[PDB]
């Protein structure tokens, strides 16, 4: 069901947030701390925004949730060097996310 | 070190 799928999405989001590597993605990026972010990234997304959307019932499917998670990971890849701490963190998050999404297909 | 954009950007 929509409800059971979204329950599991909420769990994935919590589990991502529980990782040490989630630190860059917890809150929206502030371009006053991070130079050029607004110029480079057209569509910002972060875990707090996803959590608020879940709480308000703004996702009507697990696919809508997935689109936001992917935006987080894609923005990270786009903006940061792959060998940077934040670059590495995004790769960790994406790998973990896919490892949990797999449960839909077991 | 601080978060920053790829040098090429």
Numbering used by the authors:
A (entry chain A): 1794 to 1899
B (entry chain C): 14 to 22
Paper excerpt:
Chromatin remodeling complex NoRC (nucleolar remodeling complex) interacts with the rDNA promoter regions of silent genes repressing rDNA transcription. It consists of TIP5 (TTF-I interacting protein 5), also known as BAZ2A (bromodomain [BRD] adjacent to zinc finger domain protein 2A), which is the largest subunit, and the adenosine triphosphatase (ATPase) SNF2h (sucrose nonfermenting protein 2 homologue). BAZ2B shares 29% sequence identity with TIP5 at the full-length level and harbors similar domain organization. Both proteins contain a MBD (methyl-CpG-binding domain), also known as TAM (TTF-IIP5, ARBP, MeCP1) domain, AT-hook DNA-binding domains, DDT (DNA binding homeobox and different transcription factors), and a PHD (plant homeodomain) zinc finger adjacent to a BRD at their C terminus. Our crystal structures combined with biophysical and mutagenesis data demonstrate that PHD zinc fingers recognize N-terminal unmodified H3K4 tail, whereas the TIP5 and BAZ2B BRDs recognize H4K16ac and H3K14ac, respectively, with specificity pattern KacXXR.
The crystal structures of free-state TIP5 BRD as well as in complex with H4K16acK20ac were solved at 1.76 and 1.65 Å resolution, respectively. The H4 peptide conformation extended from its N terminus at the ZA loop region to the C terminus at the BC loop region of the BRD. Several residues V1822, V1827, F1872, and V1879 provided a hydrophobic environment to accommodate the hydrophobic segment of the K16ac side chain orienting the N-acetyl group toward the amide nitrogen of N1873. Similar to the BAZ2B complex, further stabilizing contributions were provided by interaction with the conserved water network. Only few side-chain interactions with BRD residues were involved in the molecular interface, which was mediated mainly through the peptide backbone hydrogen bond interactions with TIP5 residues N1873, F1872, E1874, and R1832. An interesting interaction involved the guanidine group of H4R19 that oriented toward the BC loop, forming a hydrogen bond between its Nε-H and the carbonyl of Q1870, and a salt bridge with the two acidic residues E1874 and D1875. These features demonstrate a conservation of BRD-histone interactions between TIP5 and BAZ2B in this region. ITC determined an affinity of 23 μM for H4K16ac (G14-A15-K16ac-R17-H18-R19-K20-V21-L22), whereas binding affinity decreased 2-fold for the H4K12acK16ac (G9-L10-G11-K12ac-G13-G14-A15-K16ac-R17). However, the NoRC BRDs are characterized by a more negative electrostatic potential in this region, favoring interaction with positively charged residues such as H4R19, thus offering a rationale for the weaker interaction of this peptide with BPTF.
